[PDB]
């Protein structure tokens, strides 16, 4: 019927070798060999395009069919060639790519092409079930080819139904793949769409003769039927006569490194930070330079210098756990967990989206309600406790062997360990020198080392997840924090007795019993809302209100704590490695005024405080104590203090906050829509629309707190315990991951025993975990000492890192030392210790009943015997499986 429908008819009639010769006849191709190679090796600094797609967009660009600018959206990004190419264009500023990925579909590639810092690619996205957004440049390369034009037509029509909603937000530039432009209905539709939205159809010469696909580009203008049919003629012409040679063009070289970005970064108080910036620069004057292409938006940039790379993207498998957990070799929830990428590119790709942010200052009335509540809470906590200076001797007894040294300057680089440095008088001379500076209104050495935390986390793009920032100062600068504010931790100011709502010093054992009490109290549902990246959300004003403890100190102590807060918390100098162009690595010197650093001595103690103030303010807003106008100006501040004195403690004792983790049991469910103050303080809730009311729990046993949910379980005799539970896959997955590279079988086997024993103490109620832990304990030599880290948690008290009998250690934590356990009758055998209900166990990732597990259980005795030979026969083992 149409010139293209004719071409498709002919193409379908083609034989295998007719088609073969035809497909590339007189087409254009980019020379992709050099790119394929580097990509196989993983050379992100090559400037190589991730796909052919990059040249398909450079072609339209040079002709004037597309002039990308501003906010660029890549719908069906795949590897992201259109995305990475977009980021090189002088007028584009942000580039967000979205793709399906996973099985059978292409996943975003992580290259360091010029401007990679303005690219955010996302997988597991089905654009047909994604709401439109306003953008400046709209790109969409979706269209799976088919043998039937009936299938290609319905495939194109669905794609244009999708972009219609996007295009009515009027993007300035657009490029949409039109797979089937040649059918009557498709010509009819495209004319109607060209009328309504503009642009036109262009055929790319880089395309094979096997597709009639054209791109609906913003810079084109031509009758759609003239455009479609001139290209149909081309394709028909290429069928008849001899085969023409293919034309080869050199591929696009994007380049390498980050792009220069628009700054909204607050001005540095150089009178405070200047001496440290100038000291760093003098110890690095040979390499020190100012990078024009630094990627810092909200941080002040002070300079960079050539420095060696640190960290790795490597994850290893704990063969021991892997062999004893065969039914999970399938489960992607477990097999998908691995080490995080702590390399300079690994951390910086998270930094740019999560840490390089600037939260708008809260309003004056909000700023005041915060101040009233914070003064009240500091006065309440200090009622029974006195601030005090913590000592050198207190610190020595507290400092571990595994504690970071963090040496930044020449004079601090004298020791190889923290344990060695504290036993050196030359160290304490440095501490004394800095305190002298602090007392002279100066800071010379309190600079933060920032890097990626090596954690076990689920992956992204079939690759290791990027790493979260961890920032601590050097040992000496940390002691000065300790001596001024360490009283908060050491004298347990955030403990549940002193704070009512805190949980400092409690283990996962006890945490469940708190939420059980909390449920008995009348009121609404329980609300466990996560603040999306709490530390980054800590404002100028939050730090101001925190510094209100300073009033309860003696003038000298206040002076010391004030110099720490003002020069180290209110103002910060951060040292970070960043990947540069040419495969080089630079160390950057940046600074900021808001936010919390993870490695501050009183980070948990302050996050806890500020979170209680936040929760208290939400209860006032909910109970209608705070009004709509009270954000701008606090009308009648007396109403705040009256509420606090009447209900302050009663509401506090209805909370459980551990740093950034919280659970509030309000008076009613008005708390769910009490978001005005919440959002004004920048405490924006995680994975919810900024104004959609919060979702609460009617069942306390379902409430998430500290990565867990807690269950009341009753013994054989009848007594009860409130145990910690989480999804089994998170547990087996993390157990199956090995940190340290180049490990002897002992190092792996001993970390497998640590996981097994932790499971025996906290997760004994999970049927699979008790079995697998007994299997691990049976396959690993008995006299081998458990090693490594099983949790980074403050509530994971490491009672399982012992050679002692686990049934003895279990009785000690659940009976003997359990303050919620009246009867001290010890449990004599493990068969008395119950399991979670079969519905609950199965709800949290259990495989009871599934035949691959059922088989696994039956032959565990033999698979243990196998792992015994793997670790070595000649070793002494014991059977914990009978
Ligand atoms: N419903 C959908 N939602 C999102 N992406 C989809 C999709 N259907 C297909 N895709 C993806 O769209 C991509 C089309 S190919 C895009 C190529 C890209 N412009 C480049 O330069 O590499 C494929 O990777 C496919 O998996
Ligand atoms: Zn200092
Ligand atoms: Zn559970």
């Amino acid at each position: 019927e149409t010139l293209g429908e004719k071409w498709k008819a002919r193409l379908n009639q083609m034989s295998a070798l007719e088609f073969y010769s035809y497909k590339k006849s007189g087409i254009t191709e980019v020379c992709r060999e050099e790119a394929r190679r580097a990509l196989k090796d993983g050379v992100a600094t090559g400037g190589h395009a991730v796909s052919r797609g990059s040249a398909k967009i450079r072609w339209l660009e040079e002709r004037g069919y597309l002039q990308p600018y501003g906010k660029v959206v890549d719908l069906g990004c795949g590897r992201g060639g259109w995305s990475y190419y977009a980021a090189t264009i002088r007028k584009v500023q942000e580039v967000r790519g979205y793709t399906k990925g996973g099985p059978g579909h292409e996943e975003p590639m992580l290259v360091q092409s010029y401007g990679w810092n303005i690219v955010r690619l996302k997988s597991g996205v089905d654009v047909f079930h994604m709401a439109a957004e306003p953008c400046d440049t709209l790109l969409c390369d979706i269209g799976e080819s088919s043998s039937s034009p009936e299938v290609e037509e319905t495939r194109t029509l669905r794609v244009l139904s999708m972009v219609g909603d996007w295009l009515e937000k009027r993007p300035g530039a657009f490029c949409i793949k039109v797979l089937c432009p040649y059918t009557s209905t498709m010509m009819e539709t495209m004319e109607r769409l060209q009328r309504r939205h503009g642009g036109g159809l262009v055929r790319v010469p880089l395309c094979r003769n096997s597709t009639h696909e054209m791109y609906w580009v913003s810079g084109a203008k031509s009758n759609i039927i003239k455009s479609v049919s001139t290209t149909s003629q081309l394709l028909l012409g290429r069928m008849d006569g001899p085969r023409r040679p293919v034309k080869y063009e050199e591929d696009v070289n994007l380049g390498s490194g980050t792009r220069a970005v628009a700054s909204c970064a607050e001005a540095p108080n150089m009178k405070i930070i200047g001496r440290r910036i100038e000291r760093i620069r003098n110890e690095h004057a040979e390499t020190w330079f100012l990078d024009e292409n630094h990627p810092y938006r909200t941080w002040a940039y002070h300079g960079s210098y050539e420095a060696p790379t640190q960290g790795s993207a490597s994850s290893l498998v704990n063969g021991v756990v892997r062999l004893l957990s065969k039914p999970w070799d399938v489960v992607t929830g477990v097999t998908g967990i691995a080490m995080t990428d702590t390399t300079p590119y690994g951390q910086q790709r998270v930094f740019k989206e999560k840490v390089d942010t600037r939260v708008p200052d809260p309003q004056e009335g909000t700023r005041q309600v915060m101040n009233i509540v914070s003064s009240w809470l500091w006065k309440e906590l200090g009622k029974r406790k006195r601030p005090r200076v913590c000592t050198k001797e207190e610190f020595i007894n507290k400092v571990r062997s595994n504690a970071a040294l963090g040496a930044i300057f020449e004079e601090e680089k004298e020791w190889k360990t923290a344990v060695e440095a504290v036993n050196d008088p030359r160290f304490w001379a440095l501490v004394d020198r800095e305190r002298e500076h602090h007392l002279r209104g100066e800071c010379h050495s309190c600079v933060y080392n920032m890097m990626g935390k090596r954690e076990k986390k689920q992956g992204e793009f079939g690759k290791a997840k990027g790493s979260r920032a961890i920032w601590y100062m050097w040992l000496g600068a940390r002691f000065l924090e300790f001596e001024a504010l360490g009283f908060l931790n050491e004298d347990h100011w955030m403990g549940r007795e002193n704070s009512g709502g805190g949980v400092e010093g409690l283990g996962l054992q006890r945490l469940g019993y708190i939420l059980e009490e909390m449920n008995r109290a009348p009121g609404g549902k329980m609300y466990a809302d996560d603040t999306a990246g709490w530390d980054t959300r800590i404002s100028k004003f939050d730090l101001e209100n925190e510094a209100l403890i300073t009033n309860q100190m003696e003038e000298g102590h206040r002076t010391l704590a004030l110099a720490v807060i003002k020069y180290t918390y209110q103002n910060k100098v951060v040292k970070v490695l960043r990947p540069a162009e040419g495969g080089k690595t630079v160390m950057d010197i940046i600074s900021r005024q808001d936010q919390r650093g993870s490695g501050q001595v009183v980070t948990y103690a302050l996050n806890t405080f500020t979170n209680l103030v936040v929760q208290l303010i939400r209860n006032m807003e909910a109970e209608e104590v705070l009004e709509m106008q009270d954000l701008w100006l606090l009308r009648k501040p007396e109403k705040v203090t009256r509420w606090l004195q009447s209900n302050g403690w009663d509401r506090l004792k209805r909370m459980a906050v551990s740093g950034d983790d919280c659970v509030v049991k309000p008076i009613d469910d008005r708390f769910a829509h009490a978001l005005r103050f919440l959002n004004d303080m920048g405490k924006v809730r995680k994975d919810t629309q900024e104004w959609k009311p919060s979702t609460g729990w009617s069942n306390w046993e379902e409430v998430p707190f500290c990565s867990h949910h807690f269950n009341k379980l009753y013994l054989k005799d009848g007594r009860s315990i409130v145990v910690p539970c989480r999804h089994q896959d998170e547990l087996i997955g993390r157990a199956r991951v090995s940190p340290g590279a180049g490990w002897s079988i002992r190092e792996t086997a001993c970390l497998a025993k640590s996981y097994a024993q932790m499971w025996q103490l906290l997760y004994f109620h999970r049927r699979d975990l008790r079995l697998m832990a007994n299997a691990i304990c049976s396959a690993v030599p008995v006299d081998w000492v458990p090693t490594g880290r099983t949790t980074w948690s403050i509530h994971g008290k490491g009672e399982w890192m012992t050679t002692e009998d686990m049934l003895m250690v279990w009785n000690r934590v659940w009976i003997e030392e359990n303050d919620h356990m009246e009867d001290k009758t010890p449990v004599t055998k493990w068969t008395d210790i119950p399991y979670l209900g079969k519905r609950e166990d199965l709800w949290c990732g259990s495989l009871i009943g599934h035949r691959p597990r059922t088989t696994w259980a039956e032959n565990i005795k033999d698979t243990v015997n196998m792992v015994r030979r793997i670790i070595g026969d000649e070793e002494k083992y014991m059977d914990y499986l009978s």
Side-chain angles (χ1 to χ4, degrees):
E1 161 55 31
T2 68
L3 224 46
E5 272 171 322
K6 183 197 166 168
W7 161 90
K8 186 84 196 176
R10 273 191 66 182
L11 199 83
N12 271 45
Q13 289 156 32
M14 281 187 169
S15 76
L17 77 103
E18 267 192 277
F19 179 93
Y20 180 97
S21 320
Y22 173 62
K23 78 176 142 235
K24 300 220 239 174
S25 189
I27 75 158
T28 313
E29 275 211 330
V30 280
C31 306
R32 286 291 294 160
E33 282 299 284
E34 262 270 338
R36 274 157 190 154
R37 187 196 301 157
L39 283 160
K40 133 199 226 153
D41 309 325
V43 196
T45 60
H48 303 109
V50 286
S51 66
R52 287 194 170 271
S54 272
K56 225 150 275 163
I57 202 150
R58 187 234 327 196
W59 187 90
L60 307 164
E61 215 226 351
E62 326 295 78
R63 310 290 173 277
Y65 291 130
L66 191 68
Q67 288 276 280
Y69 77 96
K71 190 192 171 185
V72 181
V73 163
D74 194 11
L75 262 31
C77 61
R79 292 165 177 219
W82 276 21
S83 262
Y84 283 101
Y85 182 74
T88 66
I89 301 150
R90 191 175 293 197
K91 295 232 281 178
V92 329
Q93 309 176 295
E94 189 193 295
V95 179
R96 299 269 202 266
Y98 310 91
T99 205
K100 223 181 203 168
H105 303 90
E106 290 282 319
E107 284 265 6
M109 268 191 157
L110 301 142
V111 293
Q112 284 179 55
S113 102
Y114 174 80
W116 66 266
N117 57 310
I118 71 161
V119 177
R120 193 189 192 171
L121 309 169
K122 223 188 149 229
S123 260
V125 174
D126 184 331
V127 294
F128 298 117
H129 307 115
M130 176 181 164
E133 281 172 48
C135 56
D136 305 340
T137 309
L138 172 88
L139 310 180
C140 177
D141 202 8
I142 293 135
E144 190 203 343
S145 310
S146 209
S147 45
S148 186
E150 214 173 21
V151 184
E152 282 200 327
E153 187 185 66
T154 48
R155 273 169 179 180
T156 317
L157 286 180
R158 198 196 175 184
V159 173
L160 302 145
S161 199
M162 199 260 299
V163 284
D165 305 309
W166 285 81
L167 286 169
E168 49 198 15
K169 312 222 170 189
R170 210 133 151 248
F174 61 78
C175 183
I176 295 106
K177 188 167 83 169
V178 183
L179 181 67
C180 179
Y182 57 85
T183 64
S184 316
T185 321
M186 279 307 308
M187 272 158 151
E188 200 180 87
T189 307
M190 270 314 296
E191 260 155 5
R192 211 181 83 249
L193 261 64
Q194 194 200 29
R195 264 176 245 143
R196 202 202 307 184
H197 294 115
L201 284 33
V202 182
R203 167 59 173 207
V204 271
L206 300 129
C207 184
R208 289 194 188 179
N209 299 329
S210 20
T211 14
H212 205 297
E213 68 183 49
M214 288 164 113
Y215 295 89
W216 182 19
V217 287
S218 42
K221 40 168 175 189
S222 187
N223 190 265
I224 79 107
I225 296 162
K226 187 189 189 185
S227 279
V228 172
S229 304
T230 302
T231 272
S232 288
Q233 286 156 220
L234 180 78
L235 271 27
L236 297 154
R238 274 164 198 225
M239 291 187 158
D240 311 315
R243 188 199 56 88
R244 297 178 86 189
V246 42
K247 293 177 268 80
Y248 293 105
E249 278 283 349
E250 196 240 319
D251 197 7
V252 72
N253 171 267
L254 308 162
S256 31
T258 59
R259 198 168 146 81
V261 77
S263 217
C264 69
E266 227 167 84
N269 303 301
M270 292 302 293
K271 285 291 170 200
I272 297 162
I273 79 162
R275 180 53 132 246
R276 294 111 94 180
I277 315 283
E278 83 159 327
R279 276 193 68 195
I280 293 148
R281 174 235 258 150
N282 278 243
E283 306 209 357
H284 293 108
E286 305 154 290
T287 38
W288 194 270
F289 73 92
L290 258 68
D291 205 320
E292 293 159 84
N293 295 301
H294 75 84
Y296 302 107
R297 283 172 168 106
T298 77
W299 291 78
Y301 172 76
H302 301 278
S304 308
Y305 62 93
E306 226 271 319
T309 163
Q310 298 314 316
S312 81
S314 47
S315 157
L316 299 189
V317 175
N318 191 318
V320 190
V321 184
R322 195 234 162 208
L323 291 166
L324 297 165
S325 65
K326 203 171 189 160
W328 289 274
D329 278 311
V330 146
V331 197
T332 44
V334 353
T335 56
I337 291 169
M339 282 311 153
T340 48
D341 184 326
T342 65
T343 84
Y345 167 76
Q347 133 54 204
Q348 224 88 21
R349 74 166 168 87
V350 171
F351 183 92
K352 74 190 198 78
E353 296 301 324
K354 306 274 161 286
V355 188
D356 188 19
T357 57
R358 201 195 175 266
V359 62
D361 303 358
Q363 295 164 71
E364 296 119 322
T366 300
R367 172 202 217 283
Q368 192 187 336
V369 167
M370 270 150 70
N371 175 77
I372 297 157
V373 180
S374 290
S375 311
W376 177 88
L377 199 50
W378 276 130
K379 282 181 206 298
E380 278 307 319
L381 300 162
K383 214 180 83 210
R384 303 133 300 218
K385 287 170 190 279
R386 254 180 229 165
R388 60 164 177 98
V389 321
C390 282
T391 85
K392 159 181 183 167
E393 319 92 53
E394 301 206 51
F395 188 70
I396 295 147
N397 289 355
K398 197 174 153 179
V399 65
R400 296 201 247 177
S401 297
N402 63 85
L405 207 285
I408 283 156
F409 310 97
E410 275 172 54
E411 69 225 73
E412 296 143 15
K413 301 168 175 166
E414 304 250 296
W415 314 278
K416 187 132 190 180
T417 54
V419 60
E420 176 208 335
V422 295
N423 294 321
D424 197 306
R426 308 250 306 129
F427 168 93
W428 297 97
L430 290 178
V431 161
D432 302 340
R433 270 191 278 274
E434 198 55 15
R435 184 169 41 227
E436 278 175 55
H437 294 310
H438 284 195
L439 297 157
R440 280 192 287 252
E442 294 184 291
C443 196
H444 280 219
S445 73
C446 310
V447 180
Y448 286 91
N449 301 260
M450 197 203 266
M451 56 209 281
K453 201 175 200 151
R454 273 282 275 180
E455 317 153 275
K456 282 145 165 155
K457 287 281 167 284
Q458 185 71 222
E460 192 184 33
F461 321 128
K463 301 238 156 291
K465 197 111 203 300
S467 57
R468 62 142 59 258
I470 52 119
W471 35 313
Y472 59 92
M473 278 162 298
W474 100 283
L475 195 63
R478 257 184 284 143
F479 169 68
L480 299 170
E481 285 183 276
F482 176 75
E483 90 153 349
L485 304 147
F487 71 89
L488 293 158
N489 294 320
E490 298 307 288
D491 299 340
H492 309 269
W493 280 63
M494 301 308 129
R496 200 150 180 89
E497 178 181 50
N498 203 64
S499 58
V503 289
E504 187 268 345
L506 276 95
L508 270 158
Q509 303 104 79
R510 310 288 171 264
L511 298 184
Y513 285 109
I514 293 145
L515 306 174
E516 185 197 27
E517 293 161 19
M518 214 161 296
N519 197 56
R520 293 192 178 105
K525 292 152 102 191
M526 265 173 192
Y527 295 84
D529 280 354
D530 197 49
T531 299
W534 175 270
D535 284 14
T536 60
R537 296 302 183 163
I538 294 291
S539 54
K540 283 137 96 173
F541 305 170
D542 284 345
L543 295 177
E544 269 179 18
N545 296 148
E546 276 164 24
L548 292 180
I549 184 59
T550 248
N551 286 351
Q552 311 180 30
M553 301 180 191
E554 281 189 286
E555 195 167 344
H557 183 204
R558 162 149 61 263
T559 289
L560 286 170
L562 236 41
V564 153
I565 298 168
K566 207 200 190 191
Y567 314 143
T568 288
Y569 296 170
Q570 315 229 284
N571 291 274
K572 306 175 261 278
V573 174
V574 178
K575 238 197 174 213
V576 246
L577 290 164
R578 170 182 45 120
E581 44 191 290
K584 258 113 206 148
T585 294
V586 295
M587 174 77 73
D588 295 334
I589 276 72
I590 48 162
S591 79
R592 85 181 293 124
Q593 286 155 50
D594 66 330
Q595 297 190 17
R596 170 96 72 234
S598 65
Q600 290 161 9
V601 156
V602 291
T603 267
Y604 180 90
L606 297 171
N607 285 339
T608 300
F609 178 81
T610 291
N611 208 350
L612 297 158
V613 170
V614 167
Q615 294 330 293
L616 283 170
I617 295 161
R618 196 170 180 190
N619 281 120
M620 295 195 289
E621 207 201 308
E623 287 153 48
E624 287 156 65
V625 164
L626 294 168
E627 287 153 82
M628 176 177 278
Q629 314 100 289
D630 284 316
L631 275 85
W632 153 70
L633 166 102
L634 186 56
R635 188 250 178 211
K636 302 219 173 157
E638 332 92 29
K639 65 146 134 70
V640 182
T641 90
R642 292 183 317 102
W643 187 86
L644 288 173
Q645 288 165 336
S646 181
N647 314 104
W649 267 83
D650 312 300
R651 231 110 307 167
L652 226 45
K653 288 158 98 173
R654 281 164 165 265
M655 288 168 203
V657 343
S658 179
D660 53 80
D661 273 81
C662 78
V663 177
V664 189
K665 170 74 164 202
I667 294 317
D668 41 59
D669 298 323
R670 287 184 290 174
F671 190 87
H673 56 92
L675 323 169
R676 308 186 103 268
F677 271 83
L678 190 68
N679 292 324
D680 202 52
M681 309 180 286
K683 303 313 170 246
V684 317
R685 293 165 307 158
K686 183 180 260 162
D687 309 313
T688 324
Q689 193 63 258
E690 208 203 356
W691 304 92
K692 197 191 187 189
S694 297
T695 278
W697 292 264
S698 343
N699 186 23
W700 68 274
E701 283 158 286
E702 297 178 315
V703 182
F705 182 53
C706 294
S707 294
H708 284 84
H709 58 260
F710 307 76
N711 304 124
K712 197 186 181 175
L713 299 196
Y714 316 77
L715 301 171
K716 230 166 83 180
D717 61 73
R719 290 175 291 163
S720 77
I721 57 170
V722 187
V723 296
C725 177
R726 65 189 295 182
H727 202 267
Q728 226 178 58
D729 294 9
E730 294 159 15
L731 292 160
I732 301 152
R734 278 169 172 89
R736 272 189 165 224
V737 188
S738 163
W743 266 6
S744 103
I745 227 80
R746 194 190 226 278
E747 287 174 289
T748 93
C750 294
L751 173 73
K753 192 172 184 148
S754 304
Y755 276 101
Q757 288 193 167
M758 179 182 68
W759 291 359
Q760 293 187 321
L761 196 76
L762 305 170
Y763 316 110
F764 47 84
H765 51 91
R766 307 295 318 273
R767 275 165 199 87
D768 302 12
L769 295 186
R770 199 191 305 208
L771 184 54
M772 206 196 287
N774 282 337
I776 297 155
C777 291
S778 298
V780 172
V782 279
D783 298 286
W784 283 19
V785 60
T787 67
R789 221 167 221 273
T790 33
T791 34
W792 269 120
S793 182
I794 192 152
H795 305 289
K797 313 250 99 177
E799 308 96 329
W800 55 82
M801 300 292 296
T802 186
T803 156
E804 215 200 90
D805 188 328
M806 277 301 113
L807 184 66
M808 260 181 80
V809 180
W810 185 99
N811 271 285
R812 181 145 64 245
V813 321
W814 293 100
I815 312 296
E816 178 198 316
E817 309 193 336
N818 186 6
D819 313 73
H820 301 84
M821 184 88 281
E822 200 173 43
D823 174 37
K824 298 315 200 201
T825 292
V827 177
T828 50
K829 60 199 172 300
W830 282 98
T831 62
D832 298 335
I833 297 149
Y835 289 119
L836 216 64
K838 293 199 173 188
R839 182 202 59 89
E840 296 93 87
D841 200 2
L842 269 159
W843 175 257
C844 290
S846 195
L847 290 179
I848 35 162
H850 294 69
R851 58 204 291 116
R853 151 169 209 289
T854 303
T855 304
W856 167 76
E858 288 161 38
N859 322 104
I860 202 78
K861 310 194 84 177
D862 331 298
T863 55
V864 162
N865 292 131
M866 179 211 181
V867 183
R868 286 186 171 179
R869 297 212 74 233
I870 293 271
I871 286 159
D873 297 290
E874 265 173 62
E875 297 291 1
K876 174 205 157 209
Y877 303 87
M878 209 206 86
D879 164 53
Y880 299 96
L881 286 162
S882 196

